[model samples]
Target: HPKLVSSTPAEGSEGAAPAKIELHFSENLVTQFSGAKLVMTAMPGMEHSPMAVKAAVSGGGDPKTMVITPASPLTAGTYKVDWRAVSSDTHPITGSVTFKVK
Candidate 1:
């Protein structure tokens, strides 16, 4: 019933600052905000994906909001963030985003 309806970066954001990645869903989501389910990569010289990920529980706001913070800073290039999440209701969806930093 829910899906990643939108993301802040818009799946190809260019010249984006080192800001938090936000994912908005169509319904309430839970039980699937694990680090293993998120994938963030940066293409500096080679390709550097997120070695680790952290999150702040979404509360008091939209229950369908998912925000993940990367531990490493992104380089000034087109970094790819391919993400897939399985909601508590067991809905699986995959998408990708790009971040360009200066």
Candidate 2:
């Protein structure tokens, strides 16, 4: 199975909103079955279900990397990046990365 190797902003990191999110995997992925979703899970004075952030998810130039470009700057909040990656000959691998935006 493909394993998540690294990511931009890193898991649990707190910093300014990122222009994009990058996920690197241990093996080359099948772009047709590899993707991610950006979700805003927490925010100040919030009282609702997690909200989905608008973003474009796609394969990076390298076959082992997935790139997510948000539609706009993320406001202050905690976010979770839910991802699914499929390699040449394995079941779909799923994972999540969490981070905060200031």
Candidate 3:
């Protein structure tokens, strides 16, 4: 079965997350109806503030990787980026990575 190859910021890591979040997969993917959703929830004891995490696809065009960008630079806190997508073979591949930024 196909699985997530790797991520830019890496999992269980810190000091990650930029304006553009790149996620790489093992296989090429279809562009049509292919996009990712992002959500940044406030971690325990952190300020429950409103943050915007937008999702989009850009490989200079259609690509297997999905690029998720945020409205602005993230504040110092803990966050996670979970992604879901459909592979070229019409299968499903999903995973999530948590990171902290300062």
Candidate 4:
């Protein structure tokens, strides 16, 4: 299983919008099978369904890291990154990381 080693913006952290999101794994991931989704779970003074953010997920300079670059600057809100990674072993592991933009 591909274990998440660390994440940019770190889980549950609240701060300014990040230029990009990075998920570092314990093992080198299979690019074709590794990806992530950015979802805005909540926003100020708004009640609506979870909004899916436009973003690109790809292998970073290091094969063990998955980088997510959002198409636009993220608005102030709570976000969750749903990610899946497949290591050389071919087993896929899934997890989520949450952060807040203030």
Candidate 1, pairs of clashing residues: none
Model 1 superposed RMSD (Cα):
3.8
**Candidate 4 lDDT over residue span 1-102, tens digit each:** 778899998999999999999999999988998899999999888885588999999999999999999999998999999999898867789999999999
Per residue, candidate 2 scores C-alpha lDDT tens digits across 6-47 of 999899899999999999999999999889999999987886
RMSD vs true structure, all candidates: 3.8, 1.0, 3.1, 1.0
lDDT by residue (tens digit), candidate 3, 6-67: 77677766774476777777667666645665566565576765454655545424366777
Q: On a 0 to 100 scale, what is the lDDT of residue 60 in model 3?
A: 29
> Which of candidates 2 and 3 reaches a greater TM-score?
2
Q: TM-score for model 1?
A: 0.61
Candidate 4 Cα misplacement greater than 4 A, ranges = none
Off by over 4 Å in 2: none
Per-prediction TM-score to the true structure, in the order listed: 0.61, 0.95, 0.73, 0.95
Model 4 pairs in collision:
none
Q: Rank the candidates by lDDT, best first.
A: 2, 4, 3, 1
Clash count, predicted structure 4:
0
